[PDB]
Write a protein that binds this ligand. Structure first.
Ligand SMILES: Cc1cc2nc3c(=O)[nH]c(=O)nc-3n(C[C@H](O)[C@H](O)[C@H](O)COP(=O)(O)O)c2cc1C
Ligand code: SF4
Ligand code: SF4
Ligand code: SF4
Ligand code: FES
Ligand code: FES
Ligand SMILES: [Zn+2]
Lengths: 187, 219, 232, 435, 108
């Protein structure tokens, strides 16, 4: 059980070799914002919400994908102004195309996007342009209704349906800003 | 110890009290710590107060009596040790340099998740002559909820100590008569404790009902 | 239930014939055996295989998706995900010639935007749309790595260098008509032929492909000014 | 500095792409020279040559090859046998302005094939793949023909040149995606997946194609191998500089007389290249230009004399990139060009990560407003803030490449950006059209 | 109802559809009850409402002999169908869309 010691923010901890920065920051009581991360899914670092400043690293690193190395130093949005700026910018970019659907969205009140836009978001929109739009909702089965505009394209659904369950009957489809979770055609 | 008191340990993000409505967000462990002891140069008159207190009490008596000193939002809390409460209160009231004539009451607060320190009685004291005020805090366990009553020093506490008992079960030993003041003498339980259920009833509606707030979900 | 995307939405979702006839799938499997045999992993042959089905139709259809999934043991969802990612997999019946004006920054500002506007006004169709004759399908393509040959016009993925708007409309008229002007650099062939070529099945001995003016400009200047590789 | 035809040498000859035409000029001699030397010997030989990667990054070819974990030793792999190495040649050339790989492949594809074989020997990869973007169907045909000829001539397959070496080469015709040009995205697209970049680590050196060791090299970086093999390291080092030696193809394109590929030593200044090309379009002046493709920060006249080499470009903040040298003059509107580049990046984004996917869309819309009548002074500050939020934060470098045009364009032409707030682009598009 | 400290509002949402549409957008309040023997008139509901569907009139006269007569339903609360209005179950105004409604860009 080789334990690697590192300092997150000012404080120090020791965690099993291979533990991700986001897991360590969880263990020490620090809420790094995250959407695409999932403890039970292989890390993908897609949404870039969980950026943190790491000593010796020019770019911010996705805490969800940064394996802990010995003697590392990390400063989250609680102590790194640069990491704070990175996370807040990712949050803004995450909300520009998002529908103004909270009153009608079932996830309202339990939405990680809402909560982390409160904790790690700008007070108000800067986006005066036109939002991306999809026709919604669309059923991907008898049970599940998909609202693509609200999709932050984190790929957690797809990553679950591949890794956890061997059921890749949805996937990320199209490309660019138009990327969308989808079933094949009608299957 | 100088480590803070953790009254609760939040698990997961978004304040979920249980498993949580989205998967993968429940792994955070955030202890709910009250402020720890202030380092030393307490702001304003606080030092002037505490130093004076430390002078009137001995070094040994002061160390055995005052468990902690916490300045928060420019408010001074003296986490006093149980048993020694009457002596400290007498010193505060009588000493001309402290002269906290006015004890404003006693308030119980229940921290079931604070081991051995479940029930805290808070004594707001004010010194009119010196225009000062502080808050004593005495922590008692749930299994031994006994605290020394301040009646001989602050008669005003008699009713407060009673209400606090009625609402928390904090047994102020030495109080003339700890009879329930708010609730009926035959009432079972101490309502302001967290273990006591809110005791509401569903609100009725045509074809439905809303359970009380303590049953429905919260964050 | 209305499962899947709405038919009228964004770039048209993969739609069309639900399945190919028996003989069509026989031929498709005959070609797919060769396509699969050349890779260390079966799925690696997905991109070629998709071209092959795009070669059968004028565009990707649910039948092609199903055939690729069946060959590679994938789900239709995964095959669709791969297919919708790449632009070369057209999602509407394509005309005999896919004419794409390179509208990239350089080509557009060197005149490509005028090329595209003139062609759109002439063919009477917008980019991505097929002419009613079914011979040409206009498009606007990103940089094709032929930037020297400014206002480059691409046709069935052959080149047409230095195209003026008049030259562009002459070229599209020739394509819609019987005989088109030859590619400045490449050998033109029908769209389905190009699809079979991208699959790695077409005969690669097709003629054409001279260096052209721009590929040589540097060597010509070196020769005319006595430059050369120094020496061993 | 002077032009230096090395790969361009054969061109203008009759059908240079043929194997006979290639052989007539010391073709496939470098393959023999390499095959005589030991694999690690060839790796060291190239590493001493420097030969920094010609596709975008500029990483040393030698070290990239060496990172492949060769078994070596006494062949002690008694347990789990070493998984196969792979050489994936990146014949994809989709960076805007970048048209050096395509001419090389079309005219003399064998430089690649030869070099590719050599590279496969260097890393000891039993298979090699040339992932060539589609949409260059002439180039794909040329490359397939070249590989078939190489098979016919015994340079591919088994017992190559009697060295005991075996190598099977596959030309993979990539579908349409710019993002496939990146290592680990080239690999996913070659694996039959969405051409999206992977995480790193694990790096391609340890686990790339099929999670097996892989090296991805630009076609220019490979086709530059046979020349150094035949002419030695000392010949290669004479060109360029120590920190960036060698020769490279420069795709002079844009508002320039005599646009084309010029094979010149590294560090050639744009002044010299324009002089060789005869300068910008007559009657106008160089307004701005890109050293590499659009992915690199814009440059202007004030850098006309700055050398075109990796260190030289880093000296100004630009990246040398692919030596695209897109040139634009007074007639062109910086905002118009940057808007089209942002449109390209939004179209070509893989969509994987929030910063690029969303910020490119937003910037494209902002630039649309700028070119149209709308647009405000705060819009420029928003453009810079969004670019900052993309640069560095995006999953792969495509986000950095998208932000680079915006950031450099603002830094150099905030005046013109402001002027676009008067009611739109003042410039007339017709004036910029190479007639 | 979320904001009501007294739990005096009960709301059940339901889908708008072409065959039957009650509000612009995908959701509408199919059931809407206020228990006025629990309502404390605080006004937090109003501040909570994001569409101004809920307002407070100045009408105050209310009293009944039944515990149940003071649980006022949706049909008791809906404001009177002013002139120019049509029955609640109908499609949006032609060409208009929920955004057009929230921006105030609608007319009879
Ligand atoms: C978005 C993106 C696109 C790229 N496209 C290409 C390309 O089309 N051709 C290329 O040679 N390199 C491209 N690269 C650079 C690759 O890293 C390069 O091909 C590969 O790493 C080998 O580089 P080297 O041959 O110079 O050593 C691209 C990089 C990025 C981030
Ligand atoms: S639908 Fe899938 S990709 Fe979109 S937000 Fe939900 S889990 Fe993420
Ligand atoms: S920056 Fe992100 S979204 Fe853009 S191409 Fe790279 S991985 Fe895809
Ligand atoms: S006034 Fe509105 S918010 Fe307040 S109690 Fe009554 S219904 Fe609830
Ligand atoms: S949670 Fe780490 S990038 Fe999304
Ligand atoms: S800019 Fe059009 S081919 Fe490169
Ligand atoms: Zn403009």
């Amino acid at each position: 059980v080789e334990m690697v010691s590192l300092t997150i923010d000012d404080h120090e901890i020791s965690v099993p070799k291979g533990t991700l920065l986001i897991r360590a920051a969880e263990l020490m009581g620090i809420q790094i914002p995250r959407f695409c991360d999932h403890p039970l899914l292989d890390p993908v670092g897609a949404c870039r919400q969980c950026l943190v400043e790491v000593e010796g690293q020019r770019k911010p690193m996705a805490s969800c994908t940064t394996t802990v190395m010995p003697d590392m130093v990390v400063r989250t949005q609680f102590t790194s102004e640069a990491a704070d700026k990175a996370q807040r910018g990712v949050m803004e970019l995450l909300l520009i195309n998002h529908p103004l659907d909270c009153p009608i969205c079932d996830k309202g009140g339990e939405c990680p996007l809402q909560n982390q836009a409160m904790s790690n978001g700008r007070p108000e929109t800067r986006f005066e342009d036109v939002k991306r739009t999809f026709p919604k909702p669309i059923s991907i089965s008898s049970q599940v209704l998909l609202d693509r505009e609200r999709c932050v394209l984190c790929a957690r659904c797809t990553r679950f349906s591949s890794q956890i369950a061997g059921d890749p009957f949805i996937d990320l489809m199209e490309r660019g800003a138009l990327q969308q979770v989808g079933i094949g055609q009608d299957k | 110890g100088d480590e803070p008191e953790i009254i609760a340990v939040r698990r997961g993000m978004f304040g979920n009290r249980d498993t949580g409505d989205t998967s993968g967000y429940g792994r955070l462990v955030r202890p709910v710590a009250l402020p720890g002891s202030t380092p030393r140069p307490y702001g304003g008159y606080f030092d002037a107060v505490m130093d004076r207190l430390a002078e009137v009490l001995g070094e040994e008596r002061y160390a055995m009596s005052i468990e902690r000193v916490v300045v928060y939002r420019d408010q001074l809390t003296i986490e006093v040790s149980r048993v020694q409460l009457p002596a400290v209160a007498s010193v505060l009231r009588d000493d001309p340099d402290l002269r906290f004539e006015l004890c404003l009451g006693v308030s119980g607060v229940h921290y079931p998740e604070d081991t051995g320190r479940e029930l805290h009685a808070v004594y707001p004291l004010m010194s009119i002559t010196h225009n000062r005020r502080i808050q004593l805090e005495v922590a008692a366990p749930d299994a031994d909820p006994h605290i020394p009553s301040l009646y001989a020093v602050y008669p005003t506490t008699d009713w407060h100590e009673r209400e606090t008992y009625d609402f928390f079960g904090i047994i102020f030993d030495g109080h003339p008569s700890l009879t329930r003041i708010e609730m009926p003498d035959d009432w079972e339980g101490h309502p302001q404790r967290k273990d006591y259920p809110l005791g509401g009833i569903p609100v009725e509606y045509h074809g439905a009902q809303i359970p009380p707030p303590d049953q429905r979900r919260s964050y | 239930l209305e499962l899947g995307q709405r038919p009228d939405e964004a770039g048209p979702p993969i739609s069309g014939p639900a399945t190919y006839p028996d003989d069509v799938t026989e031929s498709l499997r005959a070609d797919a055996e060769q396509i699969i045999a050349r890779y260390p992993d079966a799925r690696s042959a997905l991109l070629p295989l998709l071209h092959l089905v795009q070669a059968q139709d004028g565009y990707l259809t649910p039948a092609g998706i199903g055939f690729c999934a069946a060959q590679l043991g994938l789900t239709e969802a995964e095959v669709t995900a791969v297919a919708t990612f790449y632009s070369m997999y057209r999602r509407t019946p394509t005309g005999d010639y896919l004419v794409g004006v390179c509208t990239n920054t350089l080509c557009a500002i060197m005149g490509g935007d005028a090329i595209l506007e003139a062609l759109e006004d002439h063919l009477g169709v917008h980019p991505g749309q097929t002419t009613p004759d079914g011979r040409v399908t206009l498009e606007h393509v990103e940089c094709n790595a032929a930037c020297d040959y400014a206002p480059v016009v691409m046709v069935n993925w052959e080149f047409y260098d230095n195209q003026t708007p008049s030259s562009a409309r002459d070229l599209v008229d020739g394509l819609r008509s019987g005989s088109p002007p030859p590619p400045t650099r490449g050998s033109l062939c029908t769209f389905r032929e190009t699809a079979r070529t991208l699959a790695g099945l077409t005969d690669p001995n097709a003629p054409g492909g001279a260096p052209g003016a721009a590929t040589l400009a540097g060597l010509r200047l070196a020769r005319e000014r006595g430059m050369t590789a120094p020496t061993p | 500095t002077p032009l230096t035809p090395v790969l361009s040498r054969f061109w203008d000859e009759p059908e240079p792409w043929t194997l006979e035409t290639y052989r007539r000029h010391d073709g496939y001699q470098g393959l023999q020279r390499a095959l005589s030397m030991g694999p690690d010997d060839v790796i060291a030989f190239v590493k001493d040559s420097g030969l920094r990667g010609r596709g975008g990054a500029g990483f040393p070819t030698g070290t990239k090859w060496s990172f492949i974990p060769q078994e070596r030793g006494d062949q002690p792999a008694g347990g789990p046998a070493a998984k196969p190495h792979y050489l994936v040649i990146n014949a994809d050339e989709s960076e805007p302005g970048t048209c050096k790989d395509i001419p090389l492949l079309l005219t003399t594809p064998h430089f690649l094939v030869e070099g590719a074989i050599i590279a496969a020997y260097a890393i000891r990869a039993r298979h090699a793949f040339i992932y060539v973007r589609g949409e260059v169907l002439p180039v794909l045909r040329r490359l397939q023909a070249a590989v078939a000829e190489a098979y016919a001539a015994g340079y591919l397959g088994t017992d190559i040149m009697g060295s005991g070496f075996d190598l099977d080469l596959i030309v993979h015709a990539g579908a349409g995606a710019y993002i496939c040009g990146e290592e680990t995205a080239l690999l996913d697209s070659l694996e039959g997946r969405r051409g999206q970049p992977r995480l790193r680590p694990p790096f391609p050196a340890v686990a790339g194609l099929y999670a097996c060791p892989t090296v991805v090299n630009n076609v220019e970086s490979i086709a530059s191998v046979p020349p150094i093999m035949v002419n030695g390291v000392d010949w290669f080092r004479s060109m360029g500089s120590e920190k960036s030696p060698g020769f490279t193809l420069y795709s002079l394109s844009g508002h320039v007389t005599r646009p084309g590929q010029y094979e010149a030593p590294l560090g050639i200044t744009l002044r010299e290249l324009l002089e060789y090309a005869g300068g910008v379009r007559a009657g106008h002046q160089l307004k701005f230009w890109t050293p590499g493709g659009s992915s690199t920060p814009l440059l202007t006249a004030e850098h006309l004399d700055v050398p075109l080499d990796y260190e030289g470009m880093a000296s100004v903040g630009s990246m040398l990139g692919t030596k695209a040298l897109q040139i634009f003059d007074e007639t062109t509107c910086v905002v118009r060009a940057v808007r089209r580049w942002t449109q390209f990046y939004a179209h070509e984004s893989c969509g994987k990560c929030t910063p690029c996917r969303e910020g490119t869309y937003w910037l494209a819309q902002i630039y649309a407003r700028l070119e149209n009548g709308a647009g405000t002074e705060a819009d420029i500050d928003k453009l810079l803030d969004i670019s900052d939020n993309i640069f560095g934060k995006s999953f792969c470098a495509l986000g950095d490449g998208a932000a680079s045009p915006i950031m450099s364009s603002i830094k150099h032409f905030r005046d013109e950006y402001v002027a676009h707030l008067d009611g739109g682009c003042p410039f007339d598009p017709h004036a910029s059209t190479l007639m | 109802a979320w904001a009501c400290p007294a739990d005096a509002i009960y709301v059940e949402g339901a889908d708008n559809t072409a065959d039957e549409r009650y509000s612009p957008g995908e959701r509408y309040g199919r059931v809407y009850q206020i228990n006025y023997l629990r309502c404390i008139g605080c006004g937090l509901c109003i501040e909570a409402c994001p569409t101004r569907a809920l307002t407070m009139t100045t009408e105050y006269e209310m009293a009944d002999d039944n515990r149940a007569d003071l649980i006022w339903g949706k049909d008791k609360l809906l404001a009177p169908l002013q002139e120019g209005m049509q029955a609640p179950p109908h499609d949006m105004a032609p060409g208009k869309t929920d955004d057009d409604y929230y921006l105030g860009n609608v007319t009879p």
